[PDB]
Amino acid sequence: AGDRVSFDLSVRLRGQPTFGDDRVEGKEENLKFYTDEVIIDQVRHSVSAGGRM
Amino acid sequence: ALIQSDFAQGIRMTPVPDCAGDVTACRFDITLKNAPAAGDIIELGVLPGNAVPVEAILDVDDLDTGGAPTITLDVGIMSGPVGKNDPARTCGNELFAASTVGQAGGVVRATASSAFRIQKAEDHRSVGVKVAAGPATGAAGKTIALILFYVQGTS
Amino acid sequence: ALIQSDFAQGIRMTPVPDCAGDVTACRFDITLKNAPAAGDIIELGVLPGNAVPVEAILDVDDLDTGGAPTITLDVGIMSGPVGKNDPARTCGNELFAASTVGQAGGVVRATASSAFRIQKAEDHRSVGVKVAAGPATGAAGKTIALILFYVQGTS
Amino acid sequence: SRKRTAHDLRKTGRDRLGDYFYQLTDELFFMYLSGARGINKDFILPTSFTGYA
Amino acid sequence: SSTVIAFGDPKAQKKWSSELAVDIRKKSYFESRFIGTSENAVIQRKTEVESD
């Protein structure tokens, strides 16, 4: 395939931790991602050795 | 001029029920120190996803000290994503419609007919307070709290 | 004279908690195709077995059209089995004692001392509003809603 | 262009060309027998095409 | 909360099918049963001008 690449950056999990034996089945830290786009197109050039003479 | 809370920045996560029909509530609060002003979109907390608010409670302090205060607070569901410091973001008046509890304090419960008719969406939305009327000189370091009851997996 | 909402025919099921003390709420609602008239028993929601009401917001749209409105709604635990579709059903006023909401689209909470003290039965019961007093001349298609914070496994 | 697509354009080009020539032979037979190109819009040959060779 | 990728987020990976649905060729009417050598054939093939 091709024409594009889309890679992601994951933000670090900042969040107040739960001390002293509370419950954490509810307060579940959610992952967030940022993305961008990379587009590719070929670049070509042509050197030319001369004629047989 | 957004005054972005702790819950919006992600520094304090919001609960989600592990089942449908469980009512999950958390205290969306701030200790704002620059004092409120006209047109400050205060982003308290976030609906955690496919969740519909089912009971809304404010717990503001005496946020405008003086004679005949004109302060108003209309919470609502903000437009853009969570935790994006964009002044262009707007806040509607769905959940509350110009509560006057900032004048003296106390607690107000949801009374608008649109409080319980919020439609769910697949990505987190943020509930924000807008001080639509610039109050008299308001004390700094005053707390604002919006205790939401939201139920997930509605029909 | 029975208006079976989607929550009673079985089209939409109701949430039941998977624990004890875990409150549960679901927005029982109707889209009244016709207009309310005296004697109608709007079967809107079902209260699951072994559950007792703990708090109940009744939220309705503007059910009147003219001045001096007189529509009154009372909410009770209807006697018959769920989805019987039988006019012999009785209804009652255990939850709301002829609430004055409906004269203007608004929000009312359980202000009675009998709504919070309801016994439990091991079989499903249907919660249904009844139009006790006939509405003033004029009505249209509006949504009657009733969220019901019930909890299972009390004692 | 071939990078931007998962398909192998050479094989599908050859297959479509074979398809096209089969269809062209059929078309050409009906046009010669009928004596006029007509107005058919699915025909390969253009309007006003009056025979080859 | 709970992680959600959402529908419109450009992280929604999209897979392209490799099978090419093809407009099926219309069955040519003048098949081998018509184009035949010798007289008894609606379309007569001329055996000349293949060799030589």
> What are the DSSP calls for C18-69, one per residue?
SSSS-EE--EEE---SS---TT-EEEEEEEPTTEEEEEEEEEE-----SSS-
Q: Write the CB contacts of B136 (distance below 8 Å, at least 6 apart in sequence).
A: B64, B65, B66, B69, B70, B71
**Partner residue opposite A29 with nearest CB, options B9, B13, B18:** B13
D16 C-beta neighbours (distance < 10 Å), count: 15
How far is the C-alpha of C75 from the C-alpha of C95, rounded, in Å?
Answer: 5
CA distance B18 to B48: 12
Please provide the distance, in angstroms rounded to a whole number, between the alpha carbons at the two ends of chain E.
85
| B35 CA to centre of own chain | 16
Closest CA to B73 of B108, B100, B53: B100
Q: How far is CA D11 from CA C149, D18, E16, in A?
A: 65, 11, 18
**The two three-digit tokens of residue D48, written as one number:** 């006003």
Residues of D in contact with E29 (CB under 8 A): 26, 29-30
Cβ <8 Å between A6 and E16: no
CA-nearest residue to E3 within chain A is A30
* Interacting residues of C43 by C-beta distance below 8 A, sequence separation 6+: C2, C3, C4, C5, C8, C78, C83, C89, C126, C128
The resolution in angstroms reads 3.7
Query: What is the least distance, in Å, from the CA of C23 to any CA of chain B?
Result: 6
Q: Are B146 and B47 in contact (CB under 8 A)?
A: no
Structure tokens at A28: 């579940």
Cβ within 8 Å of E, B 5-44: 13-16
Long-range contacts of A38-43 (CB under 8 A, 24+ apart): A38/A4, A38/A5, A38/A6, A38/A7, A39/A3, A39/A4, A40/A2, A40/A3, A40/A4, A40/A5, A42/D3
Specify the experimental method.
Answer: cryo-EM
Chain C CA closest to residue B110: C107
As a whole number of Å, the end-to-end CA separation of chain A is 44
Contact assessment for residue C75 and residue C145, using Cβ atoms and an 8 Å cutoff:
no
Count of Cβ atoms closer than 10 Å to residue B38 Cβ:
12
Please name the helix (run of DSSP H) or strand (run of DSSP E) that holds residue D19, with its range, or none.
helix D9-34
Q: Report the C-alpha gap between C91 and E45 in whole angstroms.
A: 93
All chains having 3 or more CB pairs closer than 8 angstroms to chain D: A, E
Q: Are C106 and B113 in contact (CB < 8 Å)?
A: yes
C-alpha–C-alpha distance, residues A12 and B9, integer Å: 12
Provide the 3-class DSSP secondary structure of residue C71.
coil
Q: How far is CA C44 from CA B151, C2, C37, C83, in A?
A: 19, 10, 16, 10
Non-local (6+) Cβ contacts of B102 within 8 A are B36, B60, B63, B64, B69, B71, B72, B73, B131, B135
Q: H or E segment at D16?
A: helix D9-34
- Chain D's closest residue to A39, CA to CA, is D4
Question: Which residue reads 């890679």 in tokens?
Answer: A7
End-to-end CA distance of chain D: 37
CA dihedral (B33, B34, B35, B41) in degrees, to 10, reads -110
The pairing of beta strand C41-47 with beta strand C27-29:
unpaired
- 3-state SS of A24-45 is CCCCCCCCCEEECCECCCCCCC
d(CA E22, CA D12): 10
Residue E7: closest CA among chain B residues belongs to which residue?
A: B122
CB B4 within 8 A of CB B83: yes
* Residue B27 amino acid letter: R
Give the whole-angstrom CA distance, residue C108 versus residue C147: 11
Q: Do chains C and E touch (3 or more CB pairs under 8 A)?
A: no
Cβ neighbourhood burial of A16 (10 Å; 0-12, 13-18, 19+): exposed
What's the rounded Cα separation, in Å, for the pair C70 and C135? Answer: 6
Name all chains with 3 or more CB-CB pairs below 8 Å to chain B: A, C, E
The shortest C-alpha distance from E25 to chain A (Å) reads 29
DSSP state of B115: S
Region for B132 from its dihedrals, namely left if φ exceeds 0, alpha if ψ lies in -120 to 50, beta otherwise: alpha
For C91, half-sphere exposure in the C-beta direction (CA atoms, 13 angstrom radius) is 27
β-strands C144-152, C73-78: how paired?
unpaired
CA dist C25 and B58 (Å) reads: 20
D49, two tokens = 């095409």
Q: What is the DSSP string of B125-152?
A: EEEEEEEEE--SS--SSEEEEEEEEEEE
Contact E9 B13 (CB under 8 A): no
Residue D10: both structure tokens together: 């050479």
As a whole number of angstroms, the distance between CA C139 and CA C144 comes to 13
Chain A contact partners (≥3 CB pairs within 8 A): B, D, E
Closest CB to E3 among A8, A31, A35 = A31
Q: Which residue has the tokens 């931007």?
A: D4
Please identify which residue in the block is written with the tokens 């003048």. Answer: E30
Distance CA B86, CA C152 (A): 44
**Residue C60, min C-alpha distance to chain B (Å):** 8
